[PDB]
Amino acid sequence: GVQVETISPGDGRTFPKRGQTCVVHYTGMLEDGKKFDSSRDRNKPFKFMLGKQEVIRGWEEGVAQMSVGQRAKLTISPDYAYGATGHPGIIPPHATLVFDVELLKLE
Numbered sequence: 001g002v003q004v005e006t007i008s009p010g011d012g013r014t015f016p017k018r019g020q021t022c023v024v025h026y027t028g029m030l031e032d033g034k035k036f037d038s039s040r041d042r043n044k045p046f047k048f049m050l051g052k053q054e055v056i057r058g059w060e061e062g063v064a065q066m067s068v069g070q071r072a073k074l075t076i077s078p079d080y081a082y083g084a085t086g087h088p089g090i091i092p093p094h095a096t097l098v099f100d101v102e103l104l105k106l107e
């Protein structure tokens with residue numbers, strides 16, 4: 001599944017609701033410690049809407065547990081990410097993913 005470990009606290013009262021757009025910055029790393037992506041490196045905050053099946057399960061459920069301003073480490077098992085397939089070119093087969101995520105604001 002997905003384990004959420006807080007790095008820095010959010011406001012503790014503003015959690016994402018389906019229908020809201022979450023705006024975040026993240027760095028994604030594999031088990032071997034290699035970075036597979038960073039919105040910070042691309043200088044482009046990642047935005048997604050809960051309940052629209054637009055992100056992996058680990059994100060859908062993990063980012064949901066975060067309050068605005070929170071920074072947390074999400075550790076996602078392959079069944080909650082890309083499974084056996086992975087995503088050739090960025091994520092290998094059966095990969096456990098670790099995302100350092102910061103919930104900036106809700107739009």
Ligand SMILES: COc1cc(C(F)(F)C(=O)N2CCCC[C@H]2C(=O)O[C@@H](CCCc2ccccc2)CCCc2cccnc2)cc(OC)c1OC
Nearest residue numbers: 026028036037038046048053054055056057059087090091
């Ligand atoms: C799957 O392909 C990508 C995955 C990432 C990723 F590794 F960071 C990643 O794994 N995610 C992106 C940030 C949110 C969490 C996760 C993700 O959900 O990506 C989805 C979409 C984001 C891809 C993207 C990210 C940033 C810029 C453009 C596109 C994958 C779409 C497939 C899917 C899975 C489950 C349900 N519905 C759809 C970054 C990418 O580009 C920067 C990707 O496309 C080139």
